[PDB]
Design a protein around this ligand. Structure first.
Ligand SMILES: Cc1ccc(-n2nc(C(C)(C)C)cc2NC(=O)Nc2ccc(OCCN3CCOCC3)c3ccccc23)cc1
Length: 326
């Protein structure tokens, strides 16, 4: 509280340095202008970050993860702080980034994007995911509202923290050994929505979700169904009647043939045959944007520290160090 000040936004106290002016709650997340940095910034006050062990891990990970990942099309930390002068009164954490404007829903709602815009939006989303995947990280909840877009159509991936719309089958079916391509399914659901201007699989429940996915992508073979689901989850799919595969061209009428082609390589039930984030950029849909040189990978993410049992006070202190060291 040495140069900080207190408000109440979202009916909760917000202690921040005085450089941050004019907090308008977005969602807790608030807008603001930074006086020193002289630009628009967003701020994320973490909810009771050290009340529980899990909160302490999630508080640590988020911080560790945003610091590690540094890419154009990914969220990046401008600043981190606490209103705490010691480890005793360390109870609150605040993360700070650039204001990216709106989410991806706003763009679709307001303006039906051309095939030119769509090319550039998915390009960035893959180029960004290529970075994250290369780090050895999975989003597991890629969706419109976890993707910010600047007015220049600049894109950035984030994790705010329905989902099932853009969720891969094997996650719903509890495969428990799913890899990075779960997100590639999500990208397809997002990209399809960009074209049509409406959700591809707006399932009203768990079953209805699967019934919509099984109509377009069709019924999987018993061989393919056995490698994307637990023994218990299979009875949900077998319950459903036999439904044939639909040709995407008939769905996405008057779409770019290339765009339809790429969706066929993303919306696949077998994860082994889904396209890679890296491969997908090579596709002729992004021929206007693809640059092999300017599509960097990320550094391997060290799990070592996290992959170890510790008490709260250790997560508390470990975090304090990571805050201050920024
Ligand atoms: C426990 C936990 C662990 C990790 C994460 N996590 N994982 C990722 C990956 C997938 C990209 C690596 C990113 C994040 N964390 C985030 O993306 N955090 C945030 C989300 C939404 C926000 O504000 C959104 C509001 N607004 C949108 C428009 O642009 C300005 C911000 C934020 C505002 C300021 C600071 C951080 C924010 C999240 C939680």
């Amino acid at each position: 509280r040495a140069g900080f000040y207190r408000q109440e936004l979202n009916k909760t106290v917000w202690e921040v340095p005085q450089r941050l002016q004019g907090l308008r709650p977005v969602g807790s997340v608030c807008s603001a202008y930074d006086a020193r940095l002289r630009q628009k910034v967003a701020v994320k006050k973490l909810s009771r970050p050290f009340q529980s062990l899990i909160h302490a891990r999630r508080t640590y990970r988020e911080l560790r993860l945003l610091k590690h990942l540094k890419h154009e099309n990914v969220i990046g930390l401008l600043d981190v702080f606490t209103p705490a002068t010691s480890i005793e009164d360390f109870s609150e954490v605040y993360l700070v980034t650039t204001l990216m404007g709106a989410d991806l829903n706003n763009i679709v709602k307001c303006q039906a994007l051309s095939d030119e815009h769509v090319q550039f939006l998915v390009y960035q989303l893959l180029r960004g995911l290529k970075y994250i995947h290369s780090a050895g990280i999975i989003h597991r909840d890629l969706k419109p509202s976890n993707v910010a877009v600047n007015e220049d159509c600049e894109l950035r991936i984030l994790d705010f923290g329905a989902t099932r719309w853009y969720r891969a089958p094997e996650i719903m079916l509890n495969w428990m050994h799913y890899n990075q391509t779960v997100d590639i399914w999500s990208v397809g659901c997002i990209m399809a929505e960009l074209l049509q201007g409406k959700a591809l699989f707006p399932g009203s429940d768990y079953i209805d979700q699967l019934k919509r996915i099984m109509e377009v992508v069709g019924t999987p073979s018993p061989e393919v169904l056995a490698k994307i689901s637990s023994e218990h989850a299979r009875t949900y799919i077998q319950s459903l009647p036999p439904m044939p595969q639909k040709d995407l061209s008939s769905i996405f009428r008057g779409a770019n043939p290339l765009a339809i082609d790429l969706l066929g390589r993303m919306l696949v039930l077998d994860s082994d045959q889904r396209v890679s984030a890296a491969e997908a950029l090579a596709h002729a849909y992004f021929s206007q944007y693809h640059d092999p040189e300017d599509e960097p990978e990320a550094e391997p993410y060290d799990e070592s520290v996290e992959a170890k049992e510790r008490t709260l006070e250790e997560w508390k202190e470990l975090t304090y160090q990571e805050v201050l060291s920024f």
